[PDB]
């Protein structure tokens, strides 16, 4: 329960650091080019491949 | 964009659903006003018929 609560509280803290677009949302981040394959697999794993 | 058109379409669809509901309420209000006007016209017509009947009764009495 403490691990799940830490995960949910981390998601809640991360939701504060976003930037909306008036019923839209956009954000920037930094990921490795060697980790670009798993990140692209997760991006395709999204509901839209946005 | 695709999400741009989707968001504009969602906002326009919400506004269209709200406008359709408000127009249905306004048409219901117009129908209720027409029903009240029909009831008032029926009351005035019954009053005019009773007035003509009482006038004919007074004329026959005289």
How would the blueprint of this fold be written?
The structure is cut from a larger assembly and holds chains A (50 residues) and B (62 residues).
Chain A lengths: L1 H15 L2 E2 L4 E2 L9 H9 L6
Antiparallel strand pairs in A: 1-2
Chain B lengths: L1 H60 L1
Q: Could you characterize what this model shows?
A:
The structure is cut from a larger assembly and holds chains A (50 residues) and B (62 residues). Chain A has helices spanning 2-16, 36-44; strands at 19-20, 25-26. With 50 residues, chain A is mainly alpha-helical. Chain A is 48% helix and 8% strand. Chain A is built from two helices and two strands; from the N terminus they run H-E-E-H. The longest helix of chain A has 15 residues, at 2-16. Chain B is mainly α and 62 residues long. Chain B is built from one helix and no strands. Chain B is rod-shaped, with a radius of gyration of 26 Å. Chain B starts with a helix and ends with a helix. The A-B interface holds A 23-24, 50 and B 3-4, 7, 10-11. Chain B: Belongs to the V-ATPase E subunit family. Chain B: Produces ATP from ADP in the presence of a proton gradient across the membrane.
Structural class by secondary-structure content of chain A: mainly alpha
* Spatial order of the strands forming the largest sheet of chain A: 1-2
Q: At CATH's second level, what is the architecture of chain B?
A: Up-down Bundle
Percent helix of chain A, as a range, is 40-55%
Number of domains of chain B: 1
**CATH topology (fold) name of chain B:** Single alpha-helices involved in coiled-coils or other helix-helix interfaces
């Amino acid at each position: 329960l403490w691990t799940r609560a830490q995960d949910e509280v981390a998601r809640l803290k991360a939701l504060e650091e976003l930037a909306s677009g008036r019923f839209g949302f956009a954000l920037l981040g930094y990921v490795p080019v060697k980790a670009k394959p798993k990140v692209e697999e997760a991006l395709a794993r999204h509901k839209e491949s946005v | 964009s695709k999400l741009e058109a989707i968001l504009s379409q969602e906002v326009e669809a919400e506004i269209q659903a709200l406008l359709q509901e408000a127009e249905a309420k306004a048409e219901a209000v117009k129908r209720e006003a027409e029903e009240k006007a029909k009831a008032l016209l029926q009351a005035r017509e019954r009053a005019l018929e009773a007035q003509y009947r009482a006038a004919l009764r007074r004329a026959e009495s005289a």
